[PDB]
Swiss-Prot record, chain A:
Location(s) in or outside the cell: Cell membrane
Residues of the full protein shown: 153 to 325 of 1170
Name the record gives this protein: Integrin alpha-L
Post-translational modification: In resting T-cells, up to 40% of surface ITGAL is constitutively phosphorylated. Phosphorylation causes conformational changes needed for ligand binding and is necessary for activation by some physiological agents.
Subunit record text: Heterodimer of an alpha and a beta subunit. The ITGAL alpha subunit associates with the ITGB2 beta subunit. Interacts with THBD. Interacts with CD226.
UniProt domain VWFA: residue ranges: 5-174
Curated annotation (Swiss-Prot), chain B:
Subcellular location: Membrane
Domain of life: Eukaryota
Function per UniProt: ICAM proteins are ligands for the leukocyte adhesion protein LFA-1 (integrin alpha-L/beta-2). ICAM3 is also a ligand for integrin alpha-D/beta-2. In association with integrin alpha-L/beta-2, contributes to apoptotic neutrophil phagocytosis by macrophages.
Subunit structure of this chain's protein: Interacts with moesin/MSN.
Tissues expressing the protein: Leukocytes.
Organism: Homo sapiens
Positions of disulphide bridges: C24-C67, C28-C71
Glycosylation: residue positions: N23, N55, N58, N72, N81
The encoding gene: ICAM3
UniProt record similarity statement: Belongs to the immunoglobulin superfamily. ICAM family.
Positions of the Ig-like C2-type domain: 17-74
Record PTM: Upon stimulation by a physiologic stimuli becomes rapidly and transiently phosphorylated on serine residues.
Name under which the protein is recorded: Intercellular adhesion molecule 3
Section covered of the full-length record: 30 to 115 of 547
Amino acid sequence: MGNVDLVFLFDGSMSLQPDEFQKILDFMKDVMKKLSNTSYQFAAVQFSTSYKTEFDFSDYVKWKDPDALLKHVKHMLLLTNTFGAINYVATEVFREELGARPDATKVLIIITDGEATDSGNIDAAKDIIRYIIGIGKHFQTKESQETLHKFASKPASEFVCILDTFECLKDLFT
Amino acid sequence: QEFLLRVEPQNPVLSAGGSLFVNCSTDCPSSEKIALETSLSKELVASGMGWAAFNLSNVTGNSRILCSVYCNGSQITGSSNITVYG
Ligand SMILES: *[C@@H]1O[C@H](CO)[C@@H](O)[C@H](O)[C@H]1NC(C)=O
Ligand SMILES: *[C@@H]1O[C@H](CO)[C@@H](O)[C@H](O)[C@H]1NC(C)=O
Ligand SMILES: [Mg+2]
């Protein structure tokens, strides 16, 4: 298995309840704990109206502690500008200056309810494997399912799943 | 250039926990994509030029909502704090 630079792009919008946001934080911490001491290195970005890199690859290498790296997170509680968020990750997070490895396979785990308050395209992230981990009552809506298909890698059956069981992520370990 | 996004009703105070009709509108010429940001169950029930109306159901507690739309390529937002008393 080659190196993998993985970015958790998590939804901090008002549409997700406080308990759901906390479940997102706990989920990211758990996935990182299971991937400690592997070819994986991480970064996390919270998105709502704006985007915030909560910790970068260099932070992960130095701390190697998910709990410590995400403890400071404050719920944004604004809009859900997902298109811009994916672009921000593609150009502002996957950078050697922030600890990214040029040789590494780029992976994005987008934890959200699937809604989007913005538009555009994500051509800049065409070389990034994108998973959608759903949470929130809006996830199963027709609007969300149609929206998330524009973000998830194909086929959707392999890259889209729910937070409670995260079945689609188990392949990251094989 | 610079317009406002109205959220009606503004900061409503209701009881029980049924439904609420929210209308997000703007006078911005050729506005694009009106969206309502809320953790409540929502259904788009009506729309016209510069506005969109939604029906929010299962309003059991206080909840803040935000509306957005693109005016002249820029995103503007409106808010409304829903208060529920029992
Ligand atoms: C929503 O508000 C706009 C702007 O005042 C109005 O023109 C429209 O008739 C309203 N629609 C509904 C469903 O009330
Ligand atoms: C309450 O709602 C108003 C919108 O009229 C908003 O400007 C204000 O920030 C809200 N108050 C809170 C919860 O900060
Ligand atoms: Mg949202």
